[PDB]
Every structure is written in structure tokens, then in C-alpha cells.
């Protein structure tokens, strides 16, 4: 807070090209988030730094709501749910933007 916390979304479907990580994503799709928080899209001039800032402080707030229930993420939930990330907060930044 105070961020933006963007509508929940069908999360995104995505060919890892690293084929261990793209049959991972499938088998444990409901990890990660559907939803991103954000600074405002205004306040940024563009796609590529509200991304790495929105891609932060998701992956920040999911971690830390994990944690705290006695839940883990592994190596590789890390690399897929940024990647994961990273797609709906460009598509956020589009239609926001829009
Ligand atoms: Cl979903
Ligand atoms: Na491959």
C-alpha cells in the first residue's frame, strides 16, 4: 500500500522453452498469481520500468503471504511465477494504459 491491486485474470498461458520448467508450470499452475499489484500506469513513462516494478512487488507480496502460512516456494516456482508475473503485468500496463 497504497498500491494498485489489478482484477484477477486466467493466468496466461506460456511456453517455457526450458521444457522441465513449462510441464512444471502446468502441474502446479494454482502457485502462482492470477492478480498484480502496481504503482499507477501514469506514473510511469514506460512499459519496461512499470513491469520490473510491478513484477517486484507482486512477486514480494505472494512470497510474504506464503511464508507466513507455512508454505515454500522452490527454485523453480521462482523463475516461473516472475515469468508469470511478468506477462500479466504487461498485459495490465496494456489495458490500463488503454
Ligand atoms: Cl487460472
Ligand atoms: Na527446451
Excluded at 14 to 20: K, S, V
Excluded at 55 to 66: A, L, R
Excluded at 76 to 89: G, L, P, S, Y
Amino acid at each position: 500500500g497504497g498500491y494498485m491491486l489489478g482484477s484477477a485474470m486466467s493466468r496466461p498461458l506460456i511456453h517455457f522453452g526450458n521444457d522441465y520448467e513449462d510441464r512444471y508450470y502446468r502441474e502446479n499452475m494454482y502457485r502462482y498469481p492470477n492478480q498484480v499489484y502496481y504503482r499507477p500506469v501514469d506514473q510511469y513513462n514506460n512499459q519496461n520500468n512499470f513491469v520490473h516494478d510491478c513484477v517486484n512487488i507482486t512477486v514480494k507480496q505472494h512470497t510474504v503471504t506464503t511464508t507466513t502460512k507455512g508454505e515454500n516456494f522452490t527454485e523453480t516456482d521462482i523463475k516461473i511465477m516472475e515469468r508469470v508475473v511478468e506477462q500479466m503485468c504487461i498485459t495490465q500496463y496494456q489495458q490500463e494504459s488503454q
